PDB file of N, CA and C in Angstrom:
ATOM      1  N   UNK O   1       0.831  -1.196   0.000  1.00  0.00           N
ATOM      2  CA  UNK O   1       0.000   0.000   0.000  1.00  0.00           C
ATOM      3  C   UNK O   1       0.868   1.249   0.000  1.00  0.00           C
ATOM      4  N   UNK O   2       2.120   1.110   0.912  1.00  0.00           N
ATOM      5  CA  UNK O   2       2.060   2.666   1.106  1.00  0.00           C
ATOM      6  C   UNK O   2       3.632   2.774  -0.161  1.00  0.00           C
ATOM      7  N   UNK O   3       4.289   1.580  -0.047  1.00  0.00           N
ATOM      8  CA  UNK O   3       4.603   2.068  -1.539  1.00  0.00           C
ATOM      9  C   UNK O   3       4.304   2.492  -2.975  1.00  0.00           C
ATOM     10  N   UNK O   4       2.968   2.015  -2.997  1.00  0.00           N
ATOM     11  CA  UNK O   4       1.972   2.797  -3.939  1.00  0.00           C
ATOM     12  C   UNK O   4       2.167   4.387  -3.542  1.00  0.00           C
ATOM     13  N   UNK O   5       1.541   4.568  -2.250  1.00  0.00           N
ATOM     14  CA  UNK O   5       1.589   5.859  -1.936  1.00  0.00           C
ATOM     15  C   UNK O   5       2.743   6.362  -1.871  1.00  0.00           C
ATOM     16  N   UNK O   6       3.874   5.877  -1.748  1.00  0.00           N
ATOM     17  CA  UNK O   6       5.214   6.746  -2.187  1.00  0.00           C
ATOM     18  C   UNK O   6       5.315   7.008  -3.543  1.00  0.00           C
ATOM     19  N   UNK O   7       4.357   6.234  -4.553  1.00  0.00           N
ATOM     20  CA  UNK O   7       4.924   5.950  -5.906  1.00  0.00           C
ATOM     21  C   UNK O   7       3.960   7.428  -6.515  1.00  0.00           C
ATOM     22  N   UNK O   8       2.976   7.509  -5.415  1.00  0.00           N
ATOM     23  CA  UNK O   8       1.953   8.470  -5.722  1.00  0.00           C
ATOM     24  C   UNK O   8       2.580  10.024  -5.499  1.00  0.00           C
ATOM     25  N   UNK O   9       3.007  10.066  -4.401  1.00  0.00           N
ATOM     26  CA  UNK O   9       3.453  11.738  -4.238  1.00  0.00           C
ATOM     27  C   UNK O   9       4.756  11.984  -5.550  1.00  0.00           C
ATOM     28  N   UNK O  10       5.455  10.879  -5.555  1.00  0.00           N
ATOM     29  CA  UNK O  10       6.844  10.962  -6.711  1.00  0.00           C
ATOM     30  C   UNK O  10       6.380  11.290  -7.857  1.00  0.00           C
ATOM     31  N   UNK O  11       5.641  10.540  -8.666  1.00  0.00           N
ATOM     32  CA  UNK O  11       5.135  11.283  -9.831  1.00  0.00           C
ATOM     33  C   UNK O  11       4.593  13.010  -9.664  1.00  0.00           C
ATOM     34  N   UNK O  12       4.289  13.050  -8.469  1.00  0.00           N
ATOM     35  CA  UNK O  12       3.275  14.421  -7.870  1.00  0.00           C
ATOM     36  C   UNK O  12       3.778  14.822  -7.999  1.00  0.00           C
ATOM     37  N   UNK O  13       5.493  14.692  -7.799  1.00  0.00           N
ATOM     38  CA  UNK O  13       6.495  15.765  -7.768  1.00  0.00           C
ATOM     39  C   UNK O  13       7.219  15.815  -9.287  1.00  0.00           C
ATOM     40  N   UNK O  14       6.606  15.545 -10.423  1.00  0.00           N
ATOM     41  CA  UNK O  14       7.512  15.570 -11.448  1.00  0.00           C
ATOM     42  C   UNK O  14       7.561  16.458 -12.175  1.00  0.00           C
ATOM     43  N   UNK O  15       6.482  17.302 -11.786  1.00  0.00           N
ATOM     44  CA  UNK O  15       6.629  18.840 -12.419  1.00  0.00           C
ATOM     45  C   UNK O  15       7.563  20.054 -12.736  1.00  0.00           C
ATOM     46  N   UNK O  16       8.470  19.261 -11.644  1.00  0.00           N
ATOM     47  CA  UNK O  16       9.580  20.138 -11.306  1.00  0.00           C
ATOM     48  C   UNK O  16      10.664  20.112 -12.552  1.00  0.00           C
ATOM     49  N   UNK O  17      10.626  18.668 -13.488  1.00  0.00           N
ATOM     50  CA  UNK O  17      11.409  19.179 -14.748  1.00  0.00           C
ATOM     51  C   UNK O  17      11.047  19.805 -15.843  1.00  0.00           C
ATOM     52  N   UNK O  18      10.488  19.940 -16.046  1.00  0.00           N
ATOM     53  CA  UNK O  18       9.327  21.280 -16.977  1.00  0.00           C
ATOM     54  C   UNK O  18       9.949  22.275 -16.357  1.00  0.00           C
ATOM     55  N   UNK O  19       9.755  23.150 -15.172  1.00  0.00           N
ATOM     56  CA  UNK O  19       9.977  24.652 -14.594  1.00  0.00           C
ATOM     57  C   UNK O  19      11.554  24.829 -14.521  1.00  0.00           C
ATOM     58  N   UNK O  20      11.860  23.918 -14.708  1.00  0.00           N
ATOM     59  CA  UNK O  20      13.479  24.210 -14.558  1.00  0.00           C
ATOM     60  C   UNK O  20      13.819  24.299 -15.775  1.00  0.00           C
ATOM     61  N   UNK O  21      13.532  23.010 -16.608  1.00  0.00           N
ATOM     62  CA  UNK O  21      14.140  23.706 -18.578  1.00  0.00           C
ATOM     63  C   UNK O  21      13.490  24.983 -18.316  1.00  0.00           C
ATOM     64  N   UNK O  22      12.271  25.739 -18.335  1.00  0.00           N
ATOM     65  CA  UNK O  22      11.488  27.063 -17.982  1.00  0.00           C
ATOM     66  C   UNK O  22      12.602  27.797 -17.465  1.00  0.00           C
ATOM     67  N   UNK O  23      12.915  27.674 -16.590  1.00  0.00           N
ATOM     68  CA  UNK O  23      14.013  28.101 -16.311  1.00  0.00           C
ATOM     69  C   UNK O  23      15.254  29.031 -17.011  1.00  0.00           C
ATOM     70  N   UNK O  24      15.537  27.688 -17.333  1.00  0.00           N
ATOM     71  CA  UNK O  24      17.191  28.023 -18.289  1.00  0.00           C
ATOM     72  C   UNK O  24      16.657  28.773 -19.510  1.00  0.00           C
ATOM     73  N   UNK O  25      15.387  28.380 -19.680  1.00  0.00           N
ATOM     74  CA  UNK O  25      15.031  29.410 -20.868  1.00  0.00           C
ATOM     75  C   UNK O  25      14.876  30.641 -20.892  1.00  0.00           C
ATOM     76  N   UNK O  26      13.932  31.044 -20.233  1.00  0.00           N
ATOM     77  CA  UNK O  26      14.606  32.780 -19.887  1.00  0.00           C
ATOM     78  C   UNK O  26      15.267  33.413 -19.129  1.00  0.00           C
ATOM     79  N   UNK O  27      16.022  32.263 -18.480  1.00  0.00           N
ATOM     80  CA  UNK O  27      17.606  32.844 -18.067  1.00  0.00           C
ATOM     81  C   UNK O  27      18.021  32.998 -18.944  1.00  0.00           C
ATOM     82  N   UNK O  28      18.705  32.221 -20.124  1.00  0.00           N
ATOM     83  CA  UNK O  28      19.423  32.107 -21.359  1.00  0.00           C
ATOM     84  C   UNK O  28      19.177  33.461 -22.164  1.00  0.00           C
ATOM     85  N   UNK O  29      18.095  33.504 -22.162  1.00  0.00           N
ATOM     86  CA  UNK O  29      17.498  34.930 -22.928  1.00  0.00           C
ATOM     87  C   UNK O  29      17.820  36.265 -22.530  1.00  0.00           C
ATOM     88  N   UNK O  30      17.412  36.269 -21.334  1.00  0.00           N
ATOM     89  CA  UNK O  30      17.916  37.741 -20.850  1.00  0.00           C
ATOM     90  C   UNK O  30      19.292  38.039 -20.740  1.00  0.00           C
ATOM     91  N   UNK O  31      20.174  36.831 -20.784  1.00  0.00           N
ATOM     92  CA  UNK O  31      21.797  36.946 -20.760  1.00  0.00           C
ATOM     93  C   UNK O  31      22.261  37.145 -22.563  1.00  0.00           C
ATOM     94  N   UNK O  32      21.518  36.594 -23.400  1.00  0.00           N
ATOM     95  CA  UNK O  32      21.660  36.806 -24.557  1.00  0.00           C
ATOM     96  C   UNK O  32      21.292  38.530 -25.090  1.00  0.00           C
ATOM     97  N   UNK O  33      20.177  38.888 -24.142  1.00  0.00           N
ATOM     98  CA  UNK O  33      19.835  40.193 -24.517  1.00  0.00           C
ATOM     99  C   UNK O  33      20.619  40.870 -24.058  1.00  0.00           C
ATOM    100  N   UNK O  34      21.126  40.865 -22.279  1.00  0.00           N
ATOM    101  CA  UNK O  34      21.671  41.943 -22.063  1.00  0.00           C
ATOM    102  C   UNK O  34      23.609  41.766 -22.562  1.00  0.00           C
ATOM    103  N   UNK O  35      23.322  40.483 -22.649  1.00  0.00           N
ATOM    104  CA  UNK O  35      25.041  40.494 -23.205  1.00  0.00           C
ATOM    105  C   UNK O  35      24.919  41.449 -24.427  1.00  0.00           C
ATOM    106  N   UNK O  36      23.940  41.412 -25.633  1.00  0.00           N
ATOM    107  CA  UNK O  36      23.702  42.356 -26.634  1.00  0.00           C
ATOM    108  C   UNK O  36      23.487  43.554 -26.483  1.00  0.00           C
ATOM    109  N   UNK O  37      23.212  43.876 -25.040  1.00  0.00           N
ATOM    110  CA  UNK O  37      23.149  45.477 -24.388  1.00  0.00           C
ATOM    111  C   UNK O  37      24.854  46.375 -24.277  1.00  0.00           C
ATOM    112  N   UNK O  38      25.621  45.093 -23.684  1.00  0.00           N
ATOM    113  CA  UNK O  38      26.567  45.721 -23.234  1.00  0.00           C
ATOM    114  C   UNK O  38      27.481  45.528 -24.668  1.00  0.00           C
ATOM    115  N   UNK O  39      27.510  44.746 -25.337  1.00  0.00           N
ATOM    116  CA  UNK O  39      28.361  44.867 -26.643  1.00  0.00           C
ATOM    117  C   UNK O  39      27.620  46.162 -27.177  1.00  0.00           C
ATOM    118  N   UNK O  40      26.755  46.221 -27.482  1.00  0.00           N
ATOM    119  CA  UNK O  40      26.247  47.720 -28.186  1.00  0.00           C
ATOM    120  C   UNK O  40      27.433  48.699 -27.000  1.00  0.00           C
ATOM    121  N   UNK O  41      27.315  48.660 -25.693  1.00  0.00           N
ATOM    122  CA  UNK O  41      27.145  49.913 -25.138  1.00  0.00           C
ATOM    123  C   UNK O  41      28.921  49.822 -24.880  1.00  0.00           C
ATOM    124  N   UNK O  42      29.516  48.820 -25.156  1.00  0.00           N
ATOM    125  CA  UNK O  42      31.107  48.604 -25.668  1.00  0.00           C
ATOM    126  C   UNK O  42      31.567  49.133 -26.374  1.00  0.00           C
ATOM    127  N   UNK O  43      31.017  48.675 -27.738  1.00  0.00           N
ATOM    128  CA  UNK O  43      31.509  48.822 -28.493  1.00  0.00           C
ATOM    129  C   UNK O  43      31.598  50.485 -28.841  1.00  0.00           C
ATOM    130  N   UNK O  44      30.745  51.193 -28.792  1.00  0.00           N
ATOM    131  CA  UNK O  44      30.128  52.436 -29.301  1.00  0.00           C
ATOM    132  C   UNK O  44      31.144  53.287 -28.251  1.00  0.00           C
ATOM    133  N   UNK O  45      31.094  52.513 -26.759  1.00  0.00           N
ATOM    134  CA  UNK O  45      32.386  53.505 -26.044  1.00  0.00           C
ATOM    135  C   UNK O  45      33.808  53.521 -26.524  1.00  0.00           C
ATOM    136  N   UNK O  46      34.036  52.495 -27.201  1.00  0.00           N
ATOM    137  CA  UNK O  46      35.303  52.352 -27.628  1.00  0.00           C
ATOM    138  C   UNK O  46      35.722  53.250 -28.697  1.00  0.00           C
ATOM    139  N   UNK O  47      34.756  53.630 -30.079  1.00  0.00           N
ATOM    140  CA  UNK O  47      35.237  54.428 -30.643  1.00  0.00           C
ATOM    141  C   UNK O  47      35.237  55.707 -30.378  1.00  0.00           C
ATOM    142  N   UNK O  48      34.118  56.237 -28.626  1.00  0.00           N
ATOM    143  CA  UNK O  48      33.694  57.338 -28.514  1.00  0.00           C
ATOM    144  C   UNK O  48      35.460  57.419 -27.920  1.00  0.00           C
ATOM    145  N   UNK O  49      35.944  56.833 -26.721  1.00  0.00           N
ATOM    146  CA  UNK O  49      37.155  57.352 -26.443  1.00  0.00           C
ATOM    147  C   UNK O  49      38.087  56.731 -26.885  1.00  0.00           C
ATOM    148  N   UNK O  50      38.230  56.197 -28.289  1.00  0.00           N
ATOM    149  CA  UNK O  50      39.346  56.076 -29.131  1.00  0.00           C
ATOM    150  C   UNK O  50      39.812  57.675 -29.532  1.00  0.00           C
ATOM    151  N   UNK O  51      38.687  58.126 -30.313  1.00  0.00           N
ATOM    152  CA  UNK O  51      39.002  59.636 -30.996  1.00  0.00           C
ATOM    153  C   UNK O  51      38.997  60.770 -30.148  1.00  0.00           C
ATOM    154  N   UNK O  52      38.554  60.428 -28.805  1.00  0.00           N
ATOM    155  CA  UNK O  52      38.970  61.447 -27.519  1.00  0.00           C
ATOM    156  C   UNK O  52      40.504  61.480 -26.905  1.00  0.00           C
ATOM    157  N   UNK O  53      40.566  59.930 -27.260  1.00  0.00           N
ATOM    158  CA  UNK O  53      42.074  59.377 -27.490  1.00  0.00           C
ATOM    159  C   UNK O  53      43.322  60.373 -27.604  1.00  0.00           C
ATOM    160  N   UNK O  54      42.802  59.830 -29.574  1.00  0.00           N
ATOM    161  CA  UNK O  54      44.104  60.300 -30.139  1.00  0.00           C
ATOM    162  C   UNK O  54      43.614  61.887 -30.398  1.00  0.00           C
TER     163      UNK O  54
ATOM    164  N   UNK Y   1      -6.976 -78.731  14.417  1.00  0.00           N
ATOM    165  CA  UNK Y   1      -6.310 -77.163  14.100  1.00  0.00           C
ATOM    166  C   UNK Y   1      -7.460 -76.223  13.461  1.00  0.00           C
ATOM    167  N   UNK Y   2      -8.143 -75.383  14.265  1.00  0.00           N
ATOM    168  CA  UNK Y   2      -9.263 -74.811  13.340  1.00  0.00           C
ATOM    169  C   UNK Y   2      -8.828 -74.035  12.454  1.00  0.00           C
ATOM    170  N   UNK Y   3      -7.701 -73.769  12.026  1.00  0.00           N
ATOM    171  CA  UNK Y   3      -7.609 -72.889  11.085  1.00  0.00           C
ATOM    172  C   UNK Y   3      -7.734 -73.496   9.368  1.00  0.00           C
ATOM    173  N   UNK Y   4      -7.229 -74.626   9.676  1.00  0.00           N
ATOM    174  CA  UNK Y   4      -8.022 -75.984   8.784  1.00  0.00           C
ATOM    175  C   UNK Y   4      -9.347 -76.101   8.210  1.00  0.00           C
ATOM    176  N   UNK Y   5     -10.296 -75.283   9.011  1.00  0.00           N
ATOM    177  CA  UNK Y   5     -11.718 -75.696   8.593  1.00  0.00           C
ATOM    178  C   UNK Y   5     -11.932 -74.577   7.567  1.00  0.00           C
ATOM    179  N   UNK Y   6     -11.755 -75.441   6.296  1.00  0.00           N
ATOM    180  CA  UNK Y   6     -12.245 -74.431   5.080  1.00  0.00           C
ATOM    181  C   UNK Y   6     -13.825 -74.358   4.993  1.00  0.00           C
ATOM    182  N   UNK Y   7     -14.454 -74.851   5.840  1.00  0.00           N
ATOM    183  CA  UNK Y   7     -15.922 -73.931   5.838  1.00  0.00           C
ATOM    184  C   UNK Y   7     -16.399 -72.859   5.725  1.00  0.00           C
ATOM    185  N   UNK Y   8     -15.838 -72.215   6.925  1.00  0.00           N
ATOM    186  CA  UNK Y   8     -15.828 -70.913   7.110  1.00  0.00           C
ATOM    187  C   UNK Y   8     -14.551 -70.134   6.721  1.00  0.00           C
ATOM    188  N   UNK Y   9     -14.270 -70.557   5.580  1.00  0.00           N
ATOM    189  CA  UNK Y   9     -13.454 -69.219   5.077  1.00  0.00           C
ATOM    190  C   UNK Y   9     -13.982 -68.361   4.800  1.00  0.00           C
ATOM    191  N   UNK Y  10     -14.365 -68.305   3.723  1.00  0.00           N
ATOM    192  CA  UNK Y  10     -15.491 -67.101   3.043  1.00  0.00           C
ATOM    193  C   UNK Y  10     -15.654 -65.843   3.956  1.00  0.00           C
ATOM    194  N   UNK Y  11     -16.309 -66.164   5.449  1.00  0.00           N
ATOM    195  CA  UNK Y  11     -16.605 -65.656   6.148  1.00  0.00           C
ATOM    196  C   UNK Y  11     -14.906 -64.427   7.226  1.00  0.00           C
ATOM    197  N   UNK Y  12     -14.495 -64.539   6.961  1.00  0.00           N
ATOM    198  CA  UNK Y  12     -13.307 -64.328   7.122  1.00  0.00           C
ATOM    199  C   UNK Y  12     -12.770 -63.571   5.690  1.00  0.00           C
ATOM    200  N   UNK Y  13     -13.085 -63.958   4.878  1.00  0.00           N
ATOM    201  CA  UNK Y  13     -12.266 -63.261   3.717  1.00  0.00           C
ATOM    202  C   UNK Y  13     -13.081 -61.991   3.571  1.00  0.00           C
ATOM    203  N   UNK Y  14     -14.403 -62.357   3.623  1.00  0.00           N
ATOM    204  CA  UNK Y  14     -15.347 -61.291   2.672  1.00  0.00           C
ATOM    205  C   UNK Y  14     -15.148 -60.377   3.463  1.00  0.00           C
ATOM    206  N   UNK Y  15     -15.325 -59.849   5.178  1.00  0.00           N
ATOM    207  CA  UNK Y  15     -15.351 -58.962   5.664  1.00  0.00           C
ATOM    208  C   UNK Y  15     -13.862 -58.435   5.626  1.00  0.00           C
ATOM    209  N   UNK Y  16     -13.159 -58.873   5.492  1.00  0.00           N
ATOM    210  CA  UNK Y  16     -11.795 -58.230   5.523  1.00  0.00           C
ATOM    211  C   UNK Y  16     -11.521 -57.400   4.138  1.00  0.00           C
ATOM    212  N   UNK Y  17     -12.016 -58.069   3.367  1.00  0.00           N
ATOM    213  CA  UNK Y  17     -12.083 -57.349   1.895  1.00  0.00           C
ATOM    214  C   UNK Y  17     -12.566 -56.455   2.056  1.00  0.00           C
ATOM    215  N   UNK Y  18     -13.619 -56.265   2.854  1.00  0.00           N
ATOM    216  CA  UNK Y  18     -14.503 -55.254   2.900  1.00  0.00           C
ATOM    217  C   UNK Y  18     -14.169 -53.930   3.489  1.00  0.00           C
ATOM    218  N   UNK Y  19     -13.365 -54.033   4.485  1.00  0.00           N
ATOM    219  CA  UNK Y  19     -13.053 -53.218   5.563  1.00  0.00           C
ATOM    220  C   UNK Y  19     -11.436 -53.001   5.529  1.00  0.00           C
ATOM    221  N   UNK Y  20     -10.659 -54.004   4.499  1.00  0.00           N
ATOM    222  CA  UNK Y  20      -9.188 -53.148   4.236  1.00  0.00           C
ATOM    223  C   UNK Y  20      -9.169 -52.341   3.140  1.00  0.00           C
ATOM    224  N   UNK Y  21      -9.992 -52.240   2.033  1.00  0.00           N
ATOM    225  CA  UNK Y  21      -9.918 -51.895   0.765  1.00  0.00           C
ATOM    226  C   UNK Y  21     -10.963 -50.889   0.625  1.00  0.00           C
ATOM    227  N   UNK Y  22     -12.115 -50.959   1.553  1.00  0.00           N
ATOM    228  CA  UNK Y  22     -13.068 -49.872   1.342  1.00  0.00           C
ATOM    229  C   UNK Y  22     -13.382 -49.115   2.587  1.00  0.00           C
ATOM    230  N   UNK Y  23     -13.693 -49.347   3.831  1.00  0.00           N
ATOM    231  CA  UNK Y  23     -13.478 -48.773   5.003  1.00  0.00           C
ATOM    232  C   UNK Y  23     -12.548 -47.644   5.358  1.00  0.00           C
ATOM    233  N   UNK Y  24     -11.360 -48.780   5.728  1.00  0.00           N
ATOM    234  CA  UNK Y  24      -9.735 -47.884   5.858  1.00  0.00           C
ATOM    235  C   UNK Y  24      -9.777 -46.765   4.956  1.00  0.00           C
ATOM    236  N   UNK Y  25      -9.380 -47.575   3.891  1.00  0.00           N
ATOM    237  CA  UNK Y  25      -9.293 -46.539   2.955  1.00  0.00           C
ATOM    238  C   UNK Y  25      -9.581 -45.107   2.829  1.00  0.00           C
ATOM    239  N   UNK Y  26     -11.191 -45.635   2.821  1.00  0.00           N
ATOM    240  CA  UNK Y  26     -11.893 -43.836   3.395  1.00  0.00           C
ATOM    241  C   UNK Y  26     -11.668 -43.109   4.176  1.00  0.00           C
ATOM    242  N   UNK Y  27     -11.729 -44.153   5.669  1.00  0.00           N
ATOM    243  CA  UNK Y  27     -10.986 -43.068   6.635  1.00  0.00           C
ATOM    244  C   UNK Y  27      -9.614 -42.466   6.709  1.00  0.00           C
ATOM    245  N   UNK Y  28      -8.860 -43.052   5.299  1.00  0.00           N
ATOM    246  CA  UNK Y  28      -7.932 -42.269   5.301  1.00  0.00           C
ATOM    247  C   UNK Y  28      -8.328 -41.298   4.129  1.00  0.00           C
ATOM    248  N   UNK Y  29      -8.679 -41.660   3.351  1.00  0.00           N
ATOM    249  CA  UNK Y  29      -8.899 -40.625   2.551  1.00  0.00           C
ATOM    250  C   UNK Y  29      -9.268 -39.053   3.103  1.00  0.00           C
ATOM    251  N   UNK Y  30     -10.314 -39.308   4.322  1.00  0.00           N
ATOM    252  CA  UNK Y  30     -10.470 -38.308   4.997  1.00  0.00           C
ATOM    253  C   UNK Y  30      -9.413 -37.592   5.664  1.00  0.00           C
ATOM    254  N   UNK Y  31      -8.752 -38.171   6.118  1.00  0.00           N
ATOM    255  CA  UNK Y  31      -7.142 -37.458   6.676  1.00  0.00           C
ATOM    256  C   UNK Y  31      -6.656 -36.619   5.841  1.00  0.00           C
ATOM    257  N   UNK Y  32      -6.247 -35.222   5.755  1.00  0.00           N
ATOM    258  CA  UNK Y  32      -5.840 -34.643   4.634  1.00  0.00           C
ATOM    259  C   UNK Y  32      -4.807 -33.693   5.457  1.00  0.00           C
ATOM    260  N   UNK Y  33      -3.518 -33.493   4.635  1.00  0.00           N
ATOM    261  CA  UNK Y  33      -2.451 -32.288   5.463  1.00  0.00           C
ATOM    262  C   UNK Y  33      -2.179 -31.504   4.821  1.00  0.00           C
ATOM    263  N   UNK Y  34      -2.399 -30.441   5.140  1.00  0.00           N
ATOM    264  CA  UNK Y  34      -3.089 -29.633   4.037  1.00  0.00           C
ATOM    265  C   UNK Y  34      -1.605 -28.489   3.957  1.00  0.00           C
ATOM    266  N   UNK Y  35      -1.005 -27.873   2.998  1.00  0.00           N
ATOM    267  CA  UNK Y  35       0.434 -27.453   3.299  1.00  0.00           C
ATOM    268  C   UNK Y  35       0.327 -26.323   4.282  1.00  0.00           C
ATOM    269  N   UNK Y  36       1.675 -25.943   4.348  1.00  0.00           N
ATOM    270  CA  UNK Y  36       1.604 -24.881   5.691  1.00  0.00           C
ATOM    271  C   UNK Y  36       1.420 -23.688   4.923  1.00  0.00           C
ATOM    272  N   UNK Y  37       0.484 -22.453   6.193  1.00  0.00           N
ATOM    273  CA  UNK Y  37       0.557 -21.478   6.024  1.00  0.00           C
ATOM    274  C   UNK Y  37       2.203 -20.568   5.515  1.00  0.00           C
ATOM    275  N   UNK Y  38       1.767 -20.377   4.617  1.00  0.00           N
ATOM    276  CA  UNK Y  38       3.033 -19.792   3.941  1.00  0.00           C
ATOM    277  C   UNK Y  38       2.722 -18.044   3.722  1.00  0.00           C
ATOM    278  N   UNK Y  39       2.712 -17.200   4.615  1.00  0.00           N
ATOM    279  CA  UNK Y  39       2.412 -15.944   4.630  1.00  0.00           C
ATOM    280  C   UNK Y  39       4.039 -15.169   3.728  1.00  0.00           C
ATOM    281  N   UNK Y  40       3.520 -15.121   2.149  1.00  0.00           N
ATOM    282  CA  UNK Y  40       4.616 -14.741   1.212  1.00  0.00           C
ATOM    283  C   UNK Y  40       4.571 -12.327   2.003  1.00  0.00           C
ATOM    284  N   UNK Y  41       6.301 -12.793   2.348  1.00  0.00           N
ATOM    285  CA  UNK Y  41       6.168 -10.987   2.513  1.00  0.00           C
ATOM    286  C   UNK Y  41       7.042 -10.580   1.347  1.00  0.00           C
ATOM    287  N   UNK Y  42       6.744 -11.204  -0.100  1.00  0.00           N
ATOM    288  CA  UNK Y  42       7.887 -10.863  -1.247  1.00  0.00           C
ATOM    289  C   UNK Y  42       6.544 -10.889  -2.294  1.00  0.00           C
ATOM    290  N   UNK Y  43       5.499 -10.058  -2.567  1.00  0.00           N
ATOM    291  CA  UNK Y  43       5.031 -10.255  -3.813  1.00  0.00           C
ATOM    292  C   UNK Y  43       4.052  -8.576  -3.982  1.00  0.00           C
ATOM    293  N   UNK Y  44       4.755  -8.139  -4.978  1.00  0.00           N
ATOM    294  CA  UNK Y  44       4.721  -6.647  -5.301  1.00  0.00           C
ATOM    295  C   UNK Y  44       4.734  -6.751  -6.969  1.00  0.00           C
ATOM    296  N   UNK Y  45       3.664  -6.782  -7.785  1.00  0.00           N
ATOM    297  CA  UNK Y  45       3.901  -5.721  -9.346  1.00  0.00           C
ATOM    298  C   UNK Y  45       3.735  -5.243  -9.237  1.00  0.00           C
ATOM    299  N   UNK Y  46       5.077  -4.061  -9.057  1.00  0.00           N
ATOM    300  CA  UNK Y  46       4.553  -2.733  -9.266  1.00  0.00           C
ATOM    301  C   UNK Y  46       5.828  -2.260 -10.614  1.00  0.00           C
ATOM    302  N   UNK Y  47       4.447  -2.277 -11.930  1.00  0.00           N
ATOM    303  CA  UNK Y  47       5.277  -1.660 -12.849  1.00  0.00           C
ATOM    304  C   UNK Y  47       7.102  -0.290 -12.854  1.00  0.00           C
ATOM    305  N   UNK Y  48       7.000  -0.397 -13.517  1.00  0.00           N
ATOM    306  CA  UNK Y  48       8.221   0.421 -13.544  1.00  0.00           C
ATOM    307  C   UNK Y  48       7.383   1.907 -13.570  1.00  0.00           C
ATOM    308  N   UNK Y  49       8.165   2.565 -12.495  1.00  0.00           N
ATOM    309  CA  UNK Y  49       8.184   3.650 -12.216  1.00  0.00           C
ATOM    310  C   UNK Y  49       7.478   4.900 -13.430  1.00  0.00           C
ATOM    311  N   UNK Y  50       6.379   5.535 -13.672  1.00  0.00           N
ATOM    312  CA  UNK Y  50       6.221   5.081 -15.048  1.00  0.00           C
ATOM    313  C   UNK Y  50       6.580   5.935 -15.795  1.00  0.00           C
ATOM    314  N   UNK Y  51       7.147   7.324 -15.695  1.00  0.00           N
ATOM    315  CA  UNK Y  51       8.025   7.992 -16.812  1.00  0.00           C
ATOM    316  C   UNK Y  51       8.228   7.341 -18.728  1.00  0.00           C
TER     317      UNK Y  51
END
């Protein structure tokens, strides 16, 4: 019986691998975006004080 | 020697026939040992986990 009922809450709990790929997914994203934030905001400083530079 | 007197054989045979081969018998037949309680603590299908 009550290994049934262990067998019962375990599946109960299997939801938890769904929310975690969920997870990595828009983690992944917002690191892809803001990594694309700071290369814009790099790059654009680099030529601003290159020619402040020289 | 009375055991000599084939007169009464018959009488001697028939009931013994009667009572080793069909009597006994029954009452053993009735005797029965029946196997032992065998309380199994090993019997579980439980499919695979089911993913």
């Amino acid at each position: 019986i009550d290994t049934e009922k262990s067998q019962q809450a375990l599946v109960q709990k299997r939801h938890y691998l769904f929310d975690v790929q969920r997870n990595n997914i828009a983690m992944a994203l917002e690191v892809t975006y803001r990594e694309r934030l700071y290369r814009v905001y790099k790059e654009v400083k680099n030529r601003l004080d290159y020619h402040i530079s020289v | 020697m009375p055991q000599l007197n084939t007169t009464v054989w018959p009488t001697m045979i028939t009931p013994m026939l009667l009572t080793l081969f069909l009597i006994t018998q029954l009452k053993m037949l009735n005797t029965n040992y029946h196997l032992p309680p065998s309380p199994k603590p090993m019997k579980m299908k439980n499919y695979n986990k089911p993913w």
